[PDB]
Design a protein around this ligand. Structure first.
Ligand SMILES: *[C@@H](CC(=O)OCC)[C@H](C[C@@H]1CCNC1=O)NC(=O)[C@H](Cc1ccccc1)NC(=O)[C@H](N)Cc1ccc(F)cc1
Ligand SMILES: *[C@@H](CC(=O)OCC)[C@H](C[C@@H]1CCNC1=O)NC(=O)[C@H](Cc1ccccc1)NC(=O)[C@H](N)Cc1ccc(F)cc1
Lengths: 304, 304
């Protein structure tokens, strides 16, 4: 029993992290086979911030202008190209520690693990959700760009995020590993705003199931509701509408606990309208929305 | 910016995890050089658990009663012995992935990362604190015994915890890697109770500094206090006394924010006496006590 913010083991990703330096600028890269992927803003200076001419900046760069180090050991760059907002540096040594991997794009509300790195050295691992406004509430400092987010599906590492920037509101934005931003963001220093965020309803319901599995049941009465009645309340509290698909994905948790999905919706409706009245659920005094149904299963079942 | 529950990168520990089977009973082991360490209750059956006579059980077994697997490769056992509550199985091959390591015994209030494993396969990593009552609030299912906790100091893995059992209250108990339990617990299935738990004051103060660094400042007041005055309030609310060494460990956070520790104590005193009033600190409606001053520095400064 117990429930924690649990990340995937990070070893397979740690072995792929490198440092990329161009001029005075250093950030992280992801070394897979004979290519290093990193944010293309490594080729910028301060003069280029508002309107970087990335093609111009890259044409002026040779392979020798890129300094790639793995564990502070230099790899030699033998080619360079741009894909969207990512630079792809071909190196003359393939990474013998490359895991089976895929590049995936995650959907809003889904979670991933982030390996926070500085100067090619991993600092820590934590769990993040892609918010409905396509930002993440990460933990990143200067030097962290090129850190990646990932999930492990079976034995495949599914890379889904590469870190690029922090908005003034303290949230984070980045790309998939093909260099396309999540959300309405660009890698130039225009003033950019995220949309109003909302609460990920299906994930709150999943977390309430995790509480029931762990014995924290005080919020469970034998109440039930309809999907439409629940959504009329959810919207008053800035919760995402619940669809029948979301109901379907909660099936395994409903199956384990014996609590129908719309009964849990009724419990959540009561928690929203009346509050938690000083009580905690799974150690939190707020309703938590960064655990997916799969996250709860995997933690409450022991998948490896 | 940002602040998450962040674990250490787990790759150096992943390479040490093995599966140990004795008859029908399987759990995890830690493979370092040519020794595998695991909980000694692997040698037990149902009737042993009231009062396992572990010396008898161990001496009557042969090396061939132990099946150790690193992935799918079998490691032949060439000796078996017991140190306190840990079994040491000498194997015929040294682990080629053995990191620099130490076995350390951590003090109450300190944090560590847990690599939760099943059948020798890592499943996830999360951060834990040793509670003042010498239990941990972990996330463990059947098959997780032998999972370890650790910190990474420089490039040395400091192993501090190996998982053995769950108390009826839902909290967890285990040993250091010398096989000595934290707290008064024993590896017998008997009614065992943890003493009252208290809140780790120095950690709450570190988390309030993390909040200020991240721009949450509403709870700051203009007052100061003394260690003696504050400690009268701490004991009213079941907080651990604050020591001068705790004040000094907070100095790096005081230096970064310009808020004296005793000023922060005065702010915490008001939070304990009035609560939060439907406001939040770092996205929580409770005072969080599982981040040490170092965890905040390491995260808010980018230690790798
Ligand atoms: C990574 C840059 C790096 O490591 O390379 C050289 C050391 C860094 C990460 C953030 C710093 C602090 N916390 C972070 O998450 N990113 C930047 O500094 C980023 C560079 C950039 C990226 C894309 C367009 C323009 C500049 N700059 C910023 O994050 C600041 N906040 C400026 C900014 C940029 C874009 C916005 F929409 C708002 C604000
Ligand atoms: C690990 C055991 C394992 O993997 O062996 C393979 C068959 C497991 C971990 C707990 C399972 C569910 N969540 C956990 O954390 N440990 C046990 O099952 C443990 C075995 C044991 C260990 C030491 C003395 C006696 C039995 N048994 C228990 O944890 C239950 N809760 C019984 C118990 C034991 C000791 C106490 F103080 C209170 C309750």
């Amino acid at each position: 029993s117990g429930f924690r913010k649990m990340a995937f083991p990070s070893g397979k990703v740690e072995g792929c992290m490198v440092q990329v330096t161009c001029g005075t600028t250093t950030l992280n890269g992801l070394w897979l086979d004979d290519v290093v992927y990193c944010p293309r803003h490594v080729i910028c200076t301060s003069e280029d911030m508002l309107n970087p001419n990335y093609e111009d900046l890259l044409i002026r760069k040779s392979n020798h202008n890129f300094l790639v180090q793995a564990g502070n050991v230099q790899l030699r760059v033998i080619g360079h190209s741009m894909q969207n907002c990512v630079l792809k540096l071909k190196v003359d040594t393939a990474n013998p520690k490359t895991p089976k991997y895929k590049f995936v794009r995650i959907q809003p509300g889904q979670t991933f693990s982030v390996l926070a790195c500085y100067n090619g050295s991993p600092s820590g691992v934590y769990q993040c959700a892609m918010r409905p406004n396509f930002t993440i509430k990460g933990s990143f400092l200067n030097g962290s760009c090129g850190s990646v987010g990932f999930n492990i599906d079976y034995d495949c590492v599914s890379f889904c995020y590469m870190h690029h920037m922090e908005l003034p509101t303290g949230v984070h934005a980045g790309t998939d590993l093909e260099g396309n931003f999540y959300g309405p963001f660009v890698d130039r220093q225009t003033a950019q705003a995220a949309g109003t965020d909302t609460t990920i309803t299906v994930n709150v319901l999943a977390w309430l199931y995790a509480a029931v599995i762990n014995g924290d049941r005080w919020f469970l009465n034998r109440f039930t509701t309809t999907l439409n009645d629940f959504n009329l309340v959810a919207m008053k509290y800035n919760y995402e509408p619940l669809t029948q698909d979301h109901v379907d994905i909660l099936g395994p948790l409903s199956a384990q606990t014996g609590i129908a999905v719309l009964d849990m919706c009724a419990s959540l409706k009561e928690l929203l309208q009346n509050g938690m009245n000083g009580r905690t659920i799974l150690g939190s005094a707020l309703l938590e929305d960064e655990f997916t149904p799969f996250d709860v299963v995997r933690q409450c079942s022991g998948v490896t």
